[PDB]
């Protein structure tokens, strides 16, 4: 995020980090329950990648994070990589995340849920802070 | 250029109609735009959330999908519209 601000450690308990085998952060994700993570189809996650929960500072070695294995990758069949439409992937975890003060689920809306233009929302992540 | 610590940013939702001024025909029904307010999602942010507080709870409204190749803070970010995909998420969770 460009022009963002550092968050309060653990205040976005659903925010996960997708990391490859080498420890490289490549995409964000959100826990929707203990066994499932929602992410972007285009992140191209495989079962060799790891889900990291309860993390704040990727630099620290003293935080109590959960490194969760991926059991299966569910790419929405409607996903059109050409148009990047319906860009969603579900990740089914091998071991269930342990909910704590720093790891919990975000709520999903109903299909009829209305989010009007002008509504202030929030986005989070470890993406570049400067291009 | 990658942060060790988790970043956050407040941003407004736009209408698909209004987002088409920036992205034209690239905006489909299953997409929702946000930003163009001095902030921007950037490389590495993808797959993450766009949440809106409602009736007191944070609700997943979008998924960081695509945007400006330069993470321009004056152009809208594109997110997967969760309302259009929630039924599939529910069918998938049910069945697995």
């Amino acid at each position: 995020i460009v022009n963002g601000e550092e968050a309060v450690p653990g205040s976005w308990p659903w925010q996960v980090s997708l990391q490859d085998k080498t420890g490289f952060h490549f995409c964000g994700g959100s826990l929707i329950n203990e066994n499932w993570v929602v992410t972007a189809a285009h992140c191209g996650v495989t079962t060799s990648d790891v889900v990291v929960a309860g993390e704040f500072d990727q630099g620290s070695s003293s935080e109590k994070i959960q490194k969760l294995k991926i059991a299966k990758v569910f790419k929405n069949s409607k996903y059109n990589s050409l148009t990047i439409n319906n860009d969603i992937t579900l990740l089914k975890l091998s071991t269930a995340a342990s909910f704590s003060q720093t790891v919990s689920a975000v709520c999903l809306p109903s299909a009829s849920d209305d989010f009007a233009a002008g509504t202030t929302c929030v986005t989070t992540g470890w993406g570049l802070t400067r291009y | 250029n990658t942060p060790d610590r988790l970043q956050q940013a407040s941003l407004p939702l736009l209408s698909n109609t209004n987002c088409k001024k920036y992205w034209g025909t690239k905006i489909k029904d299953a997409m929702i735009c946000a930003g163009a307010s001095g902030v921007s999602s950037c490389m590495g942010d993808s797959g993450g959330p766009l949440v809106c507080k409602k009736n007191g709870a944070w609700t997943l409204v979008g998924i960081v999908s695509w945007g400006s190749s330069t993470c321009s803070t004056s152009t809208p970010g594109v997110y997967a519209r969760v309302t259009a995909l929630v039924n599939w998420v529910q069918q998938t969770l049910a069945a697995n």
């Binding site: 653990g10 929707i32 709520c107 929030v122 | -």
Partner: peptide, 10 residues
Amino acid sequence: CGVPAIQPVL
């Protein structure tokens, strides 16, 4: 869901 134990400060 969607109610953090540690409140975000925006």
